[PDB]
Write a protein that binds this ligand. Structure first.
Ligand SMILES: C[C@H](O)CCCC(=O)CCC/C=C/c1cc(O)cc(O)c1
Ligand SMILES: C[C@H](O)CCCC(=O)CCC/C=C/c1cc(O)cc(O)c1
Ligand SMILES: [K+]
Ligand SMILES: [K+]
Lengths: 267, 268
């Protein structure tokens, strides 16, 4: 595993990790922007003959050396531009991409906006609705935001509290600092930027969409409807909002099999 | 509120309830076949200018006096034929219908099989998949089945433990007896009979489909996909499998508004 940094001319110094050789698979974090959540799966995926790349997102965790623009008023289109910048820097010309949440919005924006660069995209639980209870955290003090959201992650949406806690004290210390950054920059601007307003733009595209099997139906009901309308492959992964944490082996298998399917089709 | 019994020539003695005057709305129970679950909503719906009818299902609760065929090897099509028989007996010629679970399969079968009789159908959480863990209860002892399924209903699918328990001792005592009947009669044969395999048959039909907002996505994922493919209205109610228990006021409003929508469209 390569663990290093790279600077892009939009002012971001990225923390990234890379393992393996072969076709590129890129794992984009959820809004919390913490790529240690992929640690187990990166090795499993790479071992199947892929070069796997992941990174902390701008302003989050180890990628905190970034201009304010990159972690405030954040949109799917901004995030897509940033991911393209690090792919450019790492000379990754053509990639399979995974993303959950704001990461899901990001990878659909990547597929639509940069089609030459993207072999196929896997999106999981893509937020398309403003949620006032999340947006309202943006005006609270840092410590209260961190306490509220850490509890939401642990008890409401992790999909496996034991696995969530087992990320470890170091990860949760980074997450502690990320929660206010995410709260201020993401929930008010990410959902209206969802690149799924044009259903016909999705039709025929190499997109595989998932929702957590244990997620309450109302949370991403709209994903299932939109995917079905567009004829896009839609299915379930075990757990909820973080399958790469709750069920890393199932997650890795899904990423490998889906990438293999598209390598067969493209040939 | 009328609370009475009526016998149909297929050998079923039904317990039924009826309240109100106006266009007919019929509330078909879920698999447990217990119509006291509709009690609050029946009055709320009737008060908006409807005649509301409901009943215990054959072999269940107060409708237990029925031939074995009516509660064994049960299918949506069998249940639809039984519901038509009591509607005939009550001189209900044209009705809006609601049903959840096996009741959902039943009302879709009613809409497709007896279109002249059905104004519109509301289906909630329609089972299309065999679940071995439910099917396997059928070989256990009666008391074992009742204990297991009472717990499943409360903790897994009620959508509201306080409201579920508040149904009270009389209701739960009836459910206790129904669980083995349901277990032996329903889970092995109801899901294959689901009348939603032919998507094009659903298209354009006066059908409104719901799933519980709190229900785990995997449970009725297939409903959302199927409804969307058929262009059928699909949405959510609060709670899980029993919105008429967990959220009776929201349930009643949904039934009233949906029926009103179709009464408007029908005149158009
Ligand atoms: C891990 C995730 O990316 C960030 C933590 C928030 C969370 O998990 C809540 C459940 C999923 C909601 C995502 C979401 C919801 C919104 O309304 C706006 C938005 O920008 C993202
Ligand atoms: C209230 C319900 O009608 C009867 C109790 C079972 C239950 O609630 C479990 C959750 C919903 C499943 C319905 C279902 C599932 C099957 O595999 C087969 C079947 O015939 C019905
Ligand atoms: K696993
Ligand atoms: K209510």
């Amino acid at each position: 595993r390569t663990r290093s940094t790279i600077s892009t001319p939009n002012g971001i110094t990225w923390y990234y990790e890379q393992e393996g050789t072969g076709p590129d698979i890129v794992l984009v974090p959820d809004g919390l922007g913490e790529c240690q959540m992929f640690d187990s799966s990166v090795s499993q995926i790479a071992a199947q003959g892929f070069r796997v790349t992941t990174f902390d997102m701008p302003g989050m965790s180890r990628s905190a050396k970034a201009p304010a623009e990159t972690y405030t008023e954040v949109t799917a289109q901004k995030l897509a531009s940033y991911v393209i910048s690090i792919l450019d820097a790492l000379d990754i010309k053509h990639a399979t991409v995974w993303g959950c949440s704001s990461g899901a919005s990001t990878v659909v924006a990547l597929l639509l906006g940069y089609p030459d660069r993207i072999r196929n995209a896997m999106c999981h639980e893509l937020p398309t609705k403003l949620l006032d209870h999340l947006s309202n955290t943006a005006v609270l003090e840092d410590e209260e935001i961190s306490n509220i959201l850490a509890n939401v992650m642990l008890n409401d949406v992790s999909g496996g509290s034991e696995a969530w806690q087992a990320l470890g004290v170091e990860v949760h210390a980074r997450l502690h600092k990320n929660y206010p950054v995410w709260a201020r920059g993401y929930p008010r601007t990410i959902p209206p930027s969802a690149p799924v307003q044009d259903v016909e733009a999705l039709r025929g595209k190499p997109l595989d969409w998932t929702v957590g099997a244990a997620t309450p139906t109302e949370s991403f009901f709209d994903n299932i409807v939109t995917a079905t309308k567009a004829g896009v492959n839609i299915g379930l992964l075990p757990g909820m909002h973080f399958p790469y944490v709750s069920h890393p082996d199932v997650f890795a298998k899904y990423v490998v099999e889906t990438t293999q399917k598209h390598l067969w089709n493209s040939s």
